[PDB]
Design a protein around this nucleic acid. Structure first.
Lengths: 55, 88, 117, 100, 271, 51
RNA sequence: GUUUAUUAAAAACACAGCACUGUGCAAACACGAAAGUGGACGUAUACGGUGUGACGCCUGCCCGGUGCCGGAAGGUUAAU
RNA sequence: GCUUGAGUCUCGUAGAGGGGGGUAGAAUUCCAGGUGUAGCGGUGAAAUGCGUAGAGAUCUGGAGGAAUACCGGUGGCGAAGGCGGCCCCCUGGACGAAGACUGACGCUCAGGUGCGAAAGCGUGGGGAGCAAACAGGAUUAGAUACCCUGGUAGUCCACGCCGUAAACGAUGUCGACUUGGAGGUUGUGCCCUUGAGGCGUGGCUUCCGGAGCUAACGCGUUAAGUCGACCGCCUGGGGAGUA
C-alpha cells in the first residue's frame, strides 16, 4: 500500500546517493521492502525521486 | 481466467440443480469455456508454452471426466457432447 | 589572472595512471598533469607519490590563472585519489567540494573477462 | 469497469492549456461511462533529474475507473501530445485517503 | 508459418513456399491503378543503359500515398493486397469522407475493428506524424527527405529508421545501411515498420523465377573476349588483372560518391 | 559522494574516504562475473561464524 | 535451358545460391558536347559491378609487391 | 451407495511464471563541436596499439545496441530448462478461511506427444560492449596457451531446426506413518484493536540434530527411516556410448 506520492516517506528509505536502503538495516519486512522498492522505482520514473546523486 | 458471471451462467445452465458447481456436466462445461477462450489467446504469437501446459491440463482433466461420465451414465454423456459440440 | 577564480580538479585515478585536469565550472580545461609526465613510469606510476607530483604539477600549471577555490571530482579505483586531494590542499587551493564521480553502471554492458589467469 | 491511476507531467511552457487538457480528457472518459475519483492538479514541481533539458514540470493526477479501450486511446493521446513529456498509467490503486 | 515444398522436380527442390493468407485474392482497386509499360534497358536515345533488365510479367502500377495528406480524417484499414511493383505489400485505406487510397502495408492488420488517426486512435502502426512529433525511441518508415516531398526512406519491406530525439531543426536519421542523415523536422513519418519481411525469406529456386521477375542473365567479363570487357582473354579461366567495371572503374573498394551539397546533411557514412 | 557540511572546517578531511562502496562496486564491475556460487559460500561462512 | 546462322551444342555460356565492393535518392552507373532519359514512377529486405556457381563438409597461411581504403608528421611539389 | 482420495464454485493473498507492446535511467562505444597540450593505454616489467594529422582528460549536442547498480536475501515463482527497471494488455499455477457441490471421477505409465540452458544450423534483420577463429606484442628452451593491444562468427530480434549438459538433490512419481530445535517466506483464527506484542493453525523453504539406515561420508518428518503402487535403469574394467 506504500504510495509513490509520499516522497517524504520514501526519502527516509533512500540513501544520499539515491539508492534503496537494505532491509537488514532499516528493519522493514520483506513485503514492505518489495512494495517500497516498487514505489521508489515508480517515483524515480516520475522524476520525483532521483535515480542517482549526480544527475 | 473465467469470469464470475460467465461461470455462474454456466453452472446455472448445465447444472441439474442450483449451486451444483461440482457436477461433471458443470465441470466439463466450464473447462470447455476456458478451452474456447484460450484458443483465441493462443492464436496470437503462440509461444506461451507455460499457459499451454495449463491448457493441455484442462483438456486432459476434461477427457477424464467425460470418460467417467461415459462409464457411469451414457445418456448424460451423449447429451453433454451434443451441448458442447465435442468428439464429432 | 582570471576573473571567476573558481575551478574543478578532475582526478582520473585509474589503477595504472592518475590524470589531474583543472578546468573551469563550464568544463573548459585550464591545465592538466599526469603521473607518467611527472617522471615516474611503470610500477611507480600507480603509486600515491606519483599522483602527488601530478597534482603539484597541475597546480603550478594553473597558477597562472589565479584559481582560488576548486571543487574536486574523483574517478576510479586507483591509489591516487586521496593523495591528489591532499597535494592540492598542500598547494593551497581551497577545496570547496569533494565529489566521487566514478562511472558506476547499472547491470549495463558486459565487463571484460580478461586478466582471469 | 477497470480502475486506473493516471499521472502526467506537462512542459512548463505549455502550462496555460492544462485545465483544458484535463477537461477534454475527463470529458472523453465520462463519454466512455468512466468515473473520475480524484482529479488533482499538482501544479508545477521541480524534477530530480532533467528530462528533455527542462527542470520544472506541471503535474496532474486523475485516478479514474474506466474501460481499457478509453485508457488505451488516452495513452495514445499522451504519446502523441508534445506537451506531455511523461505519463504513467497504473493498476487499480483503490479507494484510500484522497489527496496524498 | 511456411508450407513445405517437396522436390518433385529440380526447380521445385529449392524454392519453399512462403505466402500470406491475409493478402487479398482478387482484382486490385481500379481508380488507384495505371499502366506501367516496361522499358527494358531503354532510353530516350534507345540504347541499353542499365543492363540485365528485360522480359517479365506485365505489372500494372498502383498509386501509393507516399505523402500522407488527408490529415484530420480517420482512415480505416482494409484487406492488404499484393503489389508487384514494390517489395512490400500495399494496404487499402478508406477514410471517413469516402476517399480510398493505397498506403504501404503496416505490420498489424485488424478486421472488423475501426481504425482511427486522431483523438480516438489506439497504439497502432501506420499512424502518420511529423518528425517533430515522433515519440522518443520510436521507429518510423516512409519518411520524407524534404518536407512535403513524399516518402523517400524506409519504403521497402522490413525497413525502418529509428529516432530518439532531435537537434531542434534537423533530425538525424539512422538508415538501414548505417548512414546518418539530417532531415528537417517538418518531414512526415509513418510509425512502425513495414511488413512483408517474411516474404523475403524464400529462395527463388530456378532461373525462370528471376526471368519472371524481370531479370535477364549476367555474363561475367572473364567469359567475354578482350573487346567486350576489360576482363577477358587467354586460354584459361582467369584473366588476371585488377577488378574493373565494363567501362574501367574499380569494382572493389573505390568509393564513387561525389555529391557535395548533401555532405553537410550526411554527417556519418556507413563502412 | 558528498554530504552537506559547513564551509569552514577545522582541517580538510573527508569523513567516509575508506568506507566508500564505490571502490568495491568498481572492483566487482571490472572483471570476474561469477555471481552464482559466492552467495552460497558467503551464507555457509556466515552461518559457521554465527554461533 | 543457351551457344559459334553455314565443319565446334561441349566439360563452354547461363542458372538458382554465395561473398565482396559501391550507392542515402537530383543515389551509384549508363546513353548523352547539353537538355534530358534509363536505373526507377524503385528507396539499402533496393539497385549496380565483380568473382564463384545447386546441395553436404568447408574455405589454411602470407598485405612483402600491385591495387584499394583511411591519416597527412615531415619532405618534394603546378598554375599563381 | 458413502466421503475420507481426487475434483468444481464463492472470497482473497504473494510472486524475476509465460507471451505481446511501450517507456525511463546510469554506463560503454561512435559522430560532430568547445577548452587544451605531450602523453595515453597496458603489465610482473615491457612492447604491439593510440597520439602533435591535437590524443588521453573535460564539457555540450546527437546516435545506437545490450544488460537492468541499489532493492537482492542458502528470498519468490515455474514440471524442468529457467525466470530480475517501470508500466499496460492477454494468460497459467499455487496457497489460505468458511461452506456448498460431484461422489473413487484416483495413482503410475513402455510405446506416444509436448516443453527443454548454452553452443550450433537456416533465412532476414541488428550490431554498443564482450569475443571462438585470426593478427601483432611479450613470457619461455619452445608457447598454435595463460598475460597484453586489436578483432570476425556468435551473443541481440523474428520465424524454423537440433534435442544435448556435472539438464544435479549426482536422490523418479504418488500416498500413509515416525523425537525435536533455530530460522526465512506467504495465508489465517483468537486475546490484550491497545508493543508487524502473546496463543494457535496451514503451504513452500534453510540449517543443525534423535531413533533408524548406510561401507563410511552422511541422510534424517522436504529420509538415503518404516511401508505400498507403478515406471525407468544396472550386472567387472578398458574396448565403448564406440562399430
Amino acid at each position: 500500500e506504500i504510495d509513490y506520492k509520499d516522497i517524504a516517506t520514501l526519502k527516509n528509505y533512500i540513501t544520499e546517493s539515491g539508492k534503496i536502503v537494505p532491509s537488514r538495516i532499516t528493519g522493514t519486512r520483506a513485503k514492505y521492502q518489495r512494495q517500497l522498492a516498487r514505489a521508489i522505482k515508480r517515483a524515480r520514473y516520475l522524476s520525483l525521486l532521483p535515480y542517482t546523486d549526480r544527475h | 481466467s473465467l469470469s464470475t458471471e460467465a461461470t455462474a451462467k454456466i453452472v446455472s445452465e448445465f447444472g441439474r440443480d442450483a449451486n451444483d458447481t461440482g457436477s461433471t456436466e458443470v465441470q466439463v462445461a466450464l473447462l470447455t469455456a476456458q478451452i474456447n477462450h484460450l484458443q483465441g489467446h493462443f492464436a496470437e504469437h503462440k509461444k506461451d508454452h507455460h499457459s499451454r501446459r495449463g491448457l493441455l491440463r484442462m483438456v486432459s482433466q476434461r477427457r477424464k471426466l467425460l470418460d467417467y461420465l461415459k462409464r457411469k451414465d451414457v445418456a448424460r454423456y451423449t447429451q453433454l457432447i451434443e451441448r458442447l459440440g465435442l468428439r464429432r | 589572472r582570471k576573473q571567476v577564480s573558481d575551478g574543478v580538479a578532475h582526478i582520473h585515478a585509474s589503477f595504472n595512471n592518475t590524470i589531474v585536469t583543472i578546468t573551469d565550472r563550464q568544463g573548459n580545461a585550464l591545465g592538466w598533469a599526469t603521473a607518467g609526465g611527472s617522471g615516474f613510469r611503470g610500477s611507480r606510476k600507480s603509486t600515491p607519490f606519483a599522483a602527488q607530483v601530478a597534482a603539484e604539477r597541475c597546480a603550478d600549471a594553473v597558477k597562472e590563472y589565479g584559481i582560488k577555490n576548486l571543487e574536486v571530482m574523483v574517478k576510479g579505483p586507483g591509489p591516487g585519489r586521496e593523495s591528489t586531494i591532499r597535494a592540492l590542499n598542500a598547494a593551497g587551493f581551497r577545496i570547496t567540494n569533494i565529489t566521487d564521480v566514478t562511472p558506476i553502471p547499472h547491470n549495463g554492458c558486459r565487463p571484460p573477462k580478461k586478466r582471469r589467469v | 469497469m477497470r480502475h486506473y491511476e493516471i499521472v502526467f507531467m506537462v512542459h512548463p511552457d505549455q502550462s496555460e492549456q492544462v485545465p483544458g487538457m484535463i477537461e477534454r480528457y475527463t470529458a472523453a472518459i465520462t463519454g466512455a461511462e468512466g468515473k473520475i475519483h480524484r482529479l488533482e492538479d499538482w501544479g508545477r514541481r521541480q524534477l530530480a533529474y532533467p528530462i528533455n533539458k527542462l527542470h520544472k514540470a506541471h503535474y496532474v493526477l486523475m485516478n479514474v475507473e474506466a474501460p481499457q479501450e478509453v485508457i488505451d486511446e488516452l495513452e495514445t493521446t499522451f504519446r502523441f501530445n508534445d506537451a506531455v513529456i511523461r505519463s504513467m498509467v497504473m493498476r487499480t490503486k483503490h479507494a484510500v485517503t484522497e489527496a496524498s | 508459418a511456411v508450407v513445405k515444398c517437396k522436390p518433385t522436380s529440380p526447380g521445385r527442390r529449392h524454392v519453399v513456399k512462403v505466402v500470406n493468407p491475409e493478402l487479398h485474392k482478387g482484382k486490385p482497386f481500379a481508380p488507384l491503378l495505371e499502366k506501367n509499360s516496361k522499358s527494358g534497358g531503354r532510353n530516350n536515345n534507345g540504347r541499353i543503359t542499365t543492363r540485365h533488365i528485360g522480359g517479365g510479367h506485365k505489372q500494372a502500377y498502383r498509386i501509393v500515398d507516399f505523402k500522407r495528406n488527408k490529415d484530420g480524417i480517420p482512415a480505416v484499414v482494409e484487406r492488404l493486397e499484393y503489389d508487384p511493383n514494390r517489395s512490400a505489400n500495399i494496404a487499402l485505406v478508406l477514410y471517413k469522407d469516402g476517399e480510398r487510397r493505397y498506403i504501404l502495408a503496416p505490420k498489424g492488420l485488424k478486421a472488423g475493428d475501426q481504425i482511427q488517426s486522431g483523438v480516438d486512435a489506439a497504439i497502432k502502426p501506420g499512424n502518420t506524424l511529423p518528425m517533430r512529433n515522433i515519440p522518443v525511441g520510436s521507429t518510423v518508415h516512409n519518411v520524407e527527405m524534404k518536407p512535403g516531398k513524399g516518402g523517400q526512406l524506409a519504403r521497402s519491406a522490413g525497413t525502418y529508421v529509428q529516432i530518439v530525439a532531435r537537434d531542434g531543426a534537423y533530425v538525424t536519421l539512422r538508415l538501414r545501411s548505417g548512414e546518418m542523415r539530417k532531415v528537417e523536422a517538418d518531414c512526415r513519418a509513418t510509425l512502425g515498420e513495414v511488413g512483408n519481411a517474411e516474404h523475403m525469406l524464400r529462395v527463388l529456386g530456378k532461373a525462370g523465377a528471376a526471368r519472371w521477375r524481370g531479370v535477364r542473365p549476367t555474363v561475367r567479363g572473364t567469359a567475354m573476349n578482350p573487346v567486350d570487357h576489360p576482363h577477358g582473354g587467354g586460354e584459361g579461366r582467369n584473366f588476371g588483372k585488377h577488378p574493373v567495371t565494363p567501362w574501367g572503374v574499380q569494382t572493389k573498394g573505390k568509393k564513387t560518391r561525389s555529391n557535395k551539397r548533401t555532405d553537410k546533411f550526411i554527417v556519418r557514412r556507413r563502412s | 559522494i558528498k554530504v552537506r557540511e559547513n564551509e569552514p572546517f577545522d582541517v580538510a578531511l573527508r569523513r567516509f574516504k575508506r568506507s566508500c562502496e564505490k571502490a568495491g562496486v568498481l572492483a566487482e564491475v571490472r572483471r570476474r562475473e561469477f555471481y552464482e556460487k559466492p552467495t552460497t559460500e558467503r551464507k555457509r561462512a556466515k552461518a559457521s561464524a554465527v554461533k
